[model samples]
Target: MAETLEFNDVYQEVKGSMNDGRLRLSRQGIIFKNSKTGKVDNIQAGELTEGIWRRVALGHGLKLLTKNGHVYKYDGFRESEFEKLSDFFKTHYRLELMEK
Candidate 1:
């Protein structure tokens, strides 16, 4: 294993607003860090219920819905990046990325 963390541009959406952050995608899960707050969170793919791509501000946002009701949102995704996100989910979690 290469033991690498694949990072992308994104932000944390809280209470209808967004916070600056970074996302590291590994084979096992996702690691989120709020750049200003320094709060960290991780979400394993296996526990994921589904993810929805919804368009709003800055770009589009993808919200991860967990089977445990732990929903997290990441904002500012370009249209092309959605392909990578969708591909990753399909490969690991086997969950479809929904959009409207």
Candidate 2:
């Protein structure tokens, strides 16, 4: 199993439906696994086009903009966790956060 550097539960819009998923960040890039189905979406670091932050009822949210023009949004994150993830992208991936 690949070692996860960071992990969190996040709300995602999958297949036009909302679902709970686990977001895993590692050297292999980003991985999103459906909480119930075990389906996984692996996105390489190089595939990231942008990162954005949006305010939600749950406190905060983050959006991943893919190079392929796909947007994946994740919410239900603590402010600290969000900052950690944001810093990871900034330091390693050089991705800046866009306010939404």
Candidate 3:
């Protein structure tokens, strides 16, 4: 399947996480990228995130990986779980800049 977000774009945001997972096999917000072209797979936590190796530990609605460099989406969690988490993060962690 095709994806809207690109690997480099996600990479710019989460390279540190990727590197962390590269060594530890799991990290939040890290995503899969094509080893050759660097394009991201449609799955949120694809091979780049080590989701294959570690997603079960993270819980349902988590993304996973398989040997084909693909990401797997878990349908176990309710949609509301994600919405709640998204709202919480956005509320607490979004950045603001000074007008000056």
Candidate 4:
């Protein structure tokens, strides 16, 4: 099965704002690196509930919801990478990506 998932030059959306960033999904968890800031934010694998996939201004978008009700969304994703992303989550995290 596939392991790590990474995407670069992506824009992270939070509170209706989009920022430059990178996304990395590993066994540890799903992490985002914001270029606008110097800190990294991550959703613990154990806390992750599911992922929501939808359309966005850039292309495709993904929203992650945690058990604690935290919502983290990312834009600038391509519809083409849907298969890889969804498969990675299902194979590694066992999390489903729902469409809306």
Please identify which of the two predictions, 3 or 4, would achieve the higher TM-score against the true structure.
4
Worst 10 residues of 1 by lDDT: 1-10
The TM-score values for the models, in the order shown, are 0.87, 0.81, 0.21, 0.93
Tens digits of per-residue lDDT for model 3, 14-60? 32232111111122233444444545533222223232111222233
RMSD of 4: 1.1
lDDT of each: 0.81, 0.75, 0.30, 0.87
> What's the TM for model 4?
0.93
The model with the greatest TM-score is 4
Cα error, residue 14 of model 2, in Å, equals 4.1
**For residue 98, what is the lDDT in candidate 3?**
13
Off by over 4 Å in 4: none
Which one wins by TM-score: 1 or 3? 1
Model 1 residue 23 CA deviation (Å) reads 0.8
- Between candidates 1 and 3, the one scoring higher on lDDT is 1
List model 1 lDDT by residue over 1-100, tens digit each: 2333454568888888788888887778888998888999989878898889888687888889888899898888887777777777777667899986
For model 3, give the 10-residue run with minimal summed lDDT.
18-27
Residue-level lDDT tens digits of model 4 in 36-73: 78569988788889898999989999989899998889
